Amino acid sequence: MRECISIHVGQAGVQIGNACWELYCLEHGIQPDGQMPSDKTIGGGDDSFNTFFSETGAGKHVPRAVFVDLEPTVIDEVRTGTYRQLFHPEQLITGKEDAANNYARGHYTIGKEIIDLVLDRIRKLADQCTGLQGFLVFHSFGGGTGSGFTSLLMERLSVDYGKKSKLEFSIYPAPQVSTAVVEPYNSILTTHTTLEHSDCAFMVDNEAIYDICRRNLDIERPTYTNLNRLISQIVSSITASLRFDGALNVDLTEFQTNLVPYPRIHFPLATYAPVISAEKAYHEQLSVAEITNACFEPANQMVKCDPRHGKYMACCLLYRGDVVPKDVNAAIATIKTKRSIQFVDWCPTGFKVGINYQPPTVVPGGDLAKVQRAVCMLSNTTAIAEAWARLDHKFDLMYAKRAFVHWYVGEGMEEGEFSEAREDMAALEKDYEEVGVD
Amino acid sequence: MYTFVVRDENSSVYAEVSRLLLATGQWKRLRKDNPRFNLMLGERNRLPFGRLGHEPGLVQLVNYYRGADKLCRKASLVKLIKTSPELSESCTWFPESYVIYPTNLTDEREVFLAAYNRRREGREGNVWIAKSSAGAGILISSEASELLDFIDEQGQVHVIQKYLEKPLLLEPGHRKFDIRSWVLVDHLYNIYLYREGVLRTSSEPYNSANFQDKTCHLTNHCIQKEYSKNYGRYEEGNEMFFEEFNQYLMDALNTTLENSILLQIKHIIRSCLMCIEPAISTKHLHYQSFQLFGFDFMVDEELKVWLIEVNGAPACAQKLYAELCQGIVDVAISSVFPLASIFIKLHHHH
Amino acid sequence: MREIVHIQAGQCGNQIGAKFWEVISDEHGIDPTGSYHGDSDLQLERINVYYNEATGNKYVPRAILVDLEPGTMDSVRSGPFGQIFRPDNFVFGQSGAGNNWAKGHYTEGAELVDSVLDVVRKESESCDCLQGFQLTHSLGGGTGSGMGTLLISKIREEYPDRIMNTFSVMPSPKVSDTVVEPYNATLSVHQLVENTDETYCIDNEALYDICFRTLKLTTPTYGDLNHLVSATMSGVTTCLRFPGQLNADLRKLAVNMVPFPRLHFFMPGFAPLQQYRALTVPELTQQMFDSKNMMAACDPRHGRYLTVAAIFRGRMSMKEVDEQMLNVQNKNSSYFVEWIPNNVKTAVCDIPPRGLKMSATFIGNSTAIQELFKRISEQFTAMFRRKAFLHWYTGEGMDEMEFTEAESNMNDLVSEYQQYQD
Amino acid sequence: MEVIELNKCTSGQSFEVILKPPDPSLEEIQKKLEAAEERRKYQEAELLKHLAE
Numbered sequence A: 001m002r003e004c005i006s007i008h009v010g011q012a013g014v015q016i017g018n019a020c021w022e023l024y025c026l027e028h029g030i031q032p033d034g035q036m037p038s039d040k041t042i043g044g045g046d047d048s049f050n051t052f053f054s055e056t057g058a059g060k061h062v063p064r065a066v067f068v069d070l071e072p073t074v075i076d077e078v079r080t081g082t083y084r085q086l087f088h089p090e091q092l093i094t095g096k097e098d099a100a101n102n103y104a105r106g107h108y109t110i111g112k113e114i115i116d117l118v119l120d121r122i123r124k125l126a127d128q129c130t131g132l133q134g135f136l137v138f139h140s141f142g143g144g145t146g147s148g149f150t151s152l153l154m155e156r157l158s159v160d161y162g163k164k165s166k167l168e169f170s171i172y173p174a175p176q177v178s179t180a181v182v183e184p185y186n187s188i189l190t191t192h193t194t195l196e197h198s199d200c201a202f203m204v205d206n207e208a209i210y211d212i213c214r215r216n217l218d219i220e221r222p223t224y225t226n227l228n229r230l231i232s233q234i235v236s237s238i239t240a241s242l243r244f245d246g247a248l249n250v251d252l253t254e255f256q257t258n259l260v261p262y263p264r265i266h267f268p269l270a271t272y273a274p275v276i277s278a279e280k281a282y283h284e285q286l287s288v289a290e291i292t293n294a295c296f297e298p299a300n301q302m303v304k305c306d307p308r309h310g311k312y313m314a315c316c317l318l319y320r321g322d323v324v325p326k327d328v329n330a331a332i333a334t335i336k337t338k339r340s341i342q343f344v345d346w347c348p349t350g351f352k353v354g355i356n357y358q359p360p361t362v363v364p365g366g367d368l369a370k371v372q373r374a375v376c377m378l379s380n381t382t383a384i385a386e387a388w389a390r391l392d393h394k395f396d397l398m399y400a401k402r403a404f405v406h407w408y409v410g411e412g413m414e415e416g417e418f419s420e421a422r423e424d425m426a427a428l429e430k431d432y433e434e435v436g437v438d
Numbered sequence B: 001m002y003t004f005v006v007r008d009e010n011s012s013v014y015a016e017v018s019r020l021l022l023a024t025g026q027w028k029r030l031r032k033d034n035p036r037f038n039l040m041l042g043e044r045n046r047l048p049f050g051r052l053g054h055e056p057g058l059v060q061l062v063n064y065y066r067g068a069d070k071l072c073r074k075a076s077l078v079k080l081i082k083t084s085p086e087l088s089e090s091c092t093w094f095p096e097s098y099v100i101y102p103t104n105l106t107d108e109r110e111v112f113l114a115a116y117n118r119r120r121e122g123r124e125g126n127v128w129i130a131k132s133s134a135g136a137g138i139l140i141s142s143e144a145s146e147l148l149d150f151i152d153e154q155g156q157v158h159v160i161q162k163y164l165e166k167p168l169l170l171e172p173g174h175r176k177f178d179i180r181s182w183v184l185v186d187h188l189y190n191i192y193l194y195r196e197g198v199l200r201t202s203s204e205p206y207n208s209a210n211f212q213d214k215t216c217h218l219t220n221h222c223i224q225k226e227y228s229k230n231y232g233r234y235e236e237g238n239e240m241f242f243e244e245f246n247q248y249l250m251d252a253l254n255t256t257l258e259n260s261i262l263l264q265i266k267h268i269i270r271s272c273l274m275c276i277e278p279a280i281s282t283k284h285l286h287y288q289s290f291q292l293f294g295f296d297f298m299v300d301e302e303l304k305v306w307l308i309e310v311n312g313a314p315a316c317a318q319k320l321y322a323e324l325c326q327g328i329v330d331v332a333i334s335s336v337f338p339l340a341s342i343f344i345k346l347h348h349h350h
Numbered sequence C: 001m002r003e004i005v006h007i008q009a010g011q012c013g014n015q016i017g018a019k020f021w022e023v024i025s026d027e028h029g030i031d032p033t034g035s036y037h038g039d040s041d042l043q044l045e046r047i048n049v050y051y052n053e054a055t056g057n058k059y060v061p062r063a064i065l066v067d068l069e070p071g072t073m074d075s076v077r078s079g080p081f082g083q084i085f086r087p088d089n090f091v092f093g094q095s096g097a098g099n100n101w102a103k104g105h106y107t108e109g110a111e112l113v114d115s116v117l118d119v120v121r122k123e124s125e126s127c128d129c130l131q132g133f134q135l136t137h138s139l140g141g142g143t144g145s146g147m148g149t150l151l152i153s154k155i156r157e158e159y160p161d162r163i164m165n166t167f168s169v170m171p172s173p174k175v176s177d178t179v180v181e182p183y184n185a186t187l188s189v190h191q192l193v194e195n196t197d198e199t200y201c202i203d204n205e206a207l208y209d210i211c212f213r214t215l216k217l218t219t220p221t222y223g224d225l226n227h228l229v230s231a232t233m234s235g236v237t238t239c240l241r242f243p244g245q246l247n248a249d250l251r252k253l254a255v256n257m258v259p260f261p262r263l264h265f266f267m268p269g270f271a272p273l274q275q276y277r278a279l280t281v282p283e284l285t286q287q288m289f290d291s292k293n294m295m296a297a298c299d300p301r302h303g304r305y306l307t308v309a310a311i312f313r314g315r316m317s318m319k320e321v322d323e324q325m326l327n328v329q330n331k332n333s334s335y336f337v338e339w340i341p342n343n344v345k346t347a348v349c350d351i352p353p354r355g356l357k358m359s360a361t362f363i364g365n366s367t368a369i370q371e372l373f374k375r376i377s378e379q380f381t382a383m384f385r386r387k388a389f390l391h392w393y394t395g396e397g398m399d400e401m402e403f404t405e406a407e408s409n410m411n412d413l414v415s416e417y418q419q420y421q422d
Numbered sequence D: 001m002e003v004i005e006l007n008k009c010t011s012g013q014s015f016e017v018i019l020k021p022p023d024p025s026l027e028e029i030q031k032k033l034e035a036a037e038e039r040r041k042y043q044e045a046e047l048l049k050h051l052a053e
Ligand SMILES: Nc1nc2c(ncn2[C@@H]2O[C@H](COP(=O)(O)OP(=O)(O)OP(=O)(O)O)[C@@H](O)[C@H]2O)c(=O)[nH]1
Pocket: A009, A010, A011, A012, A013, A015, A016, A069, A070, A098, A099, A100, A101, A102, A106, A140, A141, A142, A143, A144, A145, A146, A147, A171, A173, A174, A177, A178, A179, A180, A183, A206, A224, A227, A228, A231
C-alpha cells in the first residue's frame, strides 16, 4: 500500500476538494465523524482506501488532504461544514488577504511569506506515509491563488520531493462563471511555471461543465455547488483506481506511463457519461455500447474541442457498474467502423480498459440520478490544444496593449516573464501540431 | 439585429452575400477581429475553427466545413477515394489515379508503372495527365518517362490520372468541355444542388494527336480566355448553361440533360459527401458549419460522367451570382438566423 | 474580515457622505442609534466592512468627518443619524476654506491634517485587515478639494499598499457656487490621477439635467442631487456590503476595472430613477446603459467602454439577467474595445434597495470621460489665460508655475484617454 | 482485436485491447523571490521620495 496526498489551492480547488472528499466518503462508507464500520482493522491496515485515508487509534479515517487559501472565507466553510470532523486544524491553512486575481501577487508578494508554512504542513502528512506515491493538486487557472501560489508550490515540491509524481486538476477559465478580466494572464503565467513540474494535468473547462448542467440536468443557471458535484463525479472516476482494488492505474506512476509518452503533452482530455437529471421520474438505462459511444461526442468532454481533427496518443476507459469485458469490446468494434480515431504512427492503436463493479455513487439530494453503468474516458488528443489557442489568443489581445500589466509589475514580477511565458505556449502549440497535423 | 464578420476579402461569392445581408437592414457587419459575431465568412487557409463556439449566448456559423480539405485537395481526394470503402479503389466514376511524391521528399510510383506497363502492353489508350494543387503547371503525355520527369522538377505533391482520350465533343466545333455544378451543404447536412450549372467549353477543335498544345485539352476559364484564339465564338464567355446544353443534347443525341448527365452528377455528389459526413458533420458541435462546393465533371463520348476535382472555395459563373447567393441566404444563413426553391434536395440517410 | 475606512471632507463631502450612511444603515437594519432591527442575516454577514462593533451590540460606522468650518458638520451631528457617528471622529476647524484649494491644501488645511490622520490611524489600528479608504468630497470647493487631496497624498504615504477609493463631485457652471471651481477641480484632478486607485466621477451637471428632465423636478436643490449620489453610492458598494463573489473587495475591483494606472475614473449610473409599475429586467438594462441614467454628463456613444461592472439587486431570474446583459453587448459591440475580452461582468444581489422590487447599478470605465475633463480644462483656460482670480491663490503661497503644470497634467490625461478610443 | 493483460479481482477487472500495432534548486527560487521583493521595495521607495519632494 502506498499513500497519496491531495492538495487544494485557492477557492475553486478548495470547494471542488470539498465535493470530492464528500463523494469519497459516500463511496467508501465513511461517515461524517470519520467512522467506517466495514473497516474491520481498527486504527491501521494497508487496504486500498488507505491510500487516501489514514486511521487513528480511535478508528477515525482521516483524509490525506491539505487545503490552502490566502483568505479564510472559503476554507472556514470546511471548518464548520458537515465534514468538519474528518480533518483537523493543521490540514487547513488560511491567510488574511487574498491575491486579488493577480498571479504576481499569489506567486511572489503573498506566496513568499507562507510557502514555508504550507510545505511544513505537507511534510507532516508525508511522514505518516510508509511509501508515499505523489501529490494531487487541485486549483484554478484564473484565480490569483490557484494560479500564482500553485506554480510556486509545485516548484518547491519538485525540490523537497524530486522523485514523487504530481498530477493536476485545473479549472479552465470560462466567462459564464468567472469574475476576472485577467484570468487569461494568470492561466498562461501558471501553465508556464508549472509545466516542467506537472506529470499529468486534467483540464476541466467550466464552460463545458456549465453547459452539461444546463443541458443534461435542466439547471437554468447553475451554481458552483452544481458544478462541483459534477466535477467530483469525474474526479472520483479518475482517482477510483487508486482507492479500489484493481490493476489499471494502481499508482500515480502509471498515469504517465499510460497517458503521457511525450512529457510536454501531458493534458489528457476527459469524457464522462451518462449525466442524467435526478428530477426525471425514470430514464431508460443505457447499455455499454450506448455509454461508450457517448465518449466520442463533444457534449460530455471536460473541454469543448473536436478530436476528429486531431490525433490520439493514448486512451483509457474507466467503467463503473454492471459492465463485463465482452460488452466493452463489442462497443469498441462498432465504434471504430463509424468514428474517426486517428492515432499517431509512433503509438499503438488500443485502449486500456478498467472496470469497477460498484456503480457511481450519487450525493443524496444532489442533481445526478443513480445509473447502473457509467464510463470515464481519458484521451490524450492533440485536439485539446484548441483550448490553448483560444487562451493564447486572448492573451495576445490584451498584452499587445500592455493592459493590466502594471498590476503584475507592481507586485515585483518582471514584464519579460509575460513574453517568456507566451513564447512557451507558442512552443506548446507547435508541439501539439507537430504530432497531429500532416 | 444579427452581426457578421468578413475575413476573406478576395471571396467573390460571399462578397455578394454580405451585400445582401446588409440590404435586409437586419445584419450588422463588424471588424474582422471582433469575436462577438453570428456569422463568419472566414479565410481559406488556416481558418481558426478551434476558437469558434465559445461566446456565451451566441450561436456562431462558419462558411467552411472543417475537414473539407480531404475532398478539395488534389492528393487528398485520391487517398480518400482509394481508402474509403464507401468509394473503394474500384469506383467507376473517378479516373484511375495515383499519388506521386517528387523524389526530393505514401508514394505510389511503382504501382503507377505497373498499371502503366499493363496498358502499353495491351495496346489500350495510354495517355496520362499530371497536375497539382500548387498550380495556377500541368503536363499531358503518353510517355511515363515524361510525366515522372516533370513532377521531380517541382517540389510539391502531384497526382497522375488517366487522361480521358475519348471526351464528348460539342458541335459544331469538335471541342472539349467540362461541367461545373454548385452544391451547397447547410448545418443539417442537407445537400442542395443548384439547378443551374455551366459548361466551360473549349473554343479549339479537340486534337488527340498533339498533347503539346494544351489549348484544346484544358477547359479552364482562364486558359481559354488567354491561349485560345476562338474565345467567345460559339457561346458567351465559353460558358454554356443547362438550357442551351439541354437543347443540343436533344437535337443531336436524342436525350435530355436530366437523364444522360444530371442523374450521375446527383449521385457523385451524394456519395462523396455522405462518405465524409461522420468526419465533418457539425451535428452535436458547439458551432455550426456550411460550405459551398464547386464540382467539376467530364463527359465522354459514351455519355459517362467522371469526377475531375472538387473546389472548396469555388467561384460562380457571372450570370448566376444573384440567384445562387440569395439561395445561400435563404437555406444556409436565414435558415439559422430567421428574418422578420432554386436547389434540388438530394435526400440521403444520415 | 476586510475593513474599509470612510472619510468625508467639506460641505459637499459631508452632506453627501451623510445621506450615504443614512441610506445603507437602513439597508443593513441599523437604526439612528446604531442598534440592529433587521430581519435577514445577509444584513450582518458583511456588516463589519463599514461598521465597527461596540459594546451592547452597537454598530458604529468607520467614518471620519472633516471640515474647516463647523457649519456643515454641526448639521450632521443634529441630523437624523447624527447621533450614530463616533463623537471623536468629528475633526473641524473654524477659519473655513472659502472655496480656495490653496487654503485647503497648503495653509488652513495644513494646520488640521496632522489631527485628521491621527484618527485615521486609530480606526486602522483596530482593523483586523484593512482593505483601504473611501473618500467623499467635491472638487470645486476649498476644503474637500484642497484638503481632501492633501489627505490622500498623506494617507498614501502612511498606507502605500492600501486601496484609495473616492467619490469626487465635478463642478458645473450650471450649478456653480463660485467662478473659481474650474481652478479647484483641475488642481485636485492631478492629485486624483496620481494617488488614487478608483474615482467615481459625479458631474453635478449630469445630476442637474437628470433632476430637471428625467425626474421632471422644476427647480433642483443640492438635497435633490444628493438622493442620486446616495442611491448611486448605495449600489457601487453593494459588492462590498453583502455576500458575493464578484468584486468582493476593493483591490479585486481595481484589478478588473483599471487596465492602466492613470485611467481609473469611472462613469456610474443606475435605474430606475406612474411610479407603482413593476420594472422588467429588460427595462432595467435599456435604461441602465442609456446616457440619461449616468451621472457623468458624457455621451458614451462619443467614446468606448474599457470595462463595465453591472450589479443587479432584488429577487429576479438570474438567468434572465445573463440573457439581457449579453444582448446589450451583442447589439452595441462597436462601443466596447475588442482588445479586452469579456470586459463586462455581472453580479447579482438578493437584497434590493429603498422600496424597490429590483434595481441595477452601472460602473463604467469609459473613454468618453475625456469629454468631462475637456469642459473643466476649457473653463480653466478661459480664465487662466488672463490670470483672472489668480490673486485669491497667489496670495496663499502658490505660483502661476504650479497652475501651468496642473493645466498640462490634465491635457496629458485627455490625450491618454484619446489614444485608446482609436 | 486482441485482449491482453487481463486481471480479475473481487471488486472488478481490467485489461488491454489492441487493434493495430505502431528544475530550479531551493537557492534559485529564493533568489527569484528576493529579486521580486527587491523590485517592490525599490518602487515603494521612489513613491515615497516623490511624496517627500
Ligand atoms: N468549477 C468551479 N470553478 C470555480 C469554483 N470557484 C472558483 N472557480 C473558478 O475559479 C476562477 C477564479 O479562481 P478562484 O479560485 O476563485 O481565485 P483564488 O484561487 O481564490 O485566488 P484569489 O485571486 O486570491 O482569490 C473563476 O474563473 C471561477 O470560475 C468552483 O467552486 N468550481
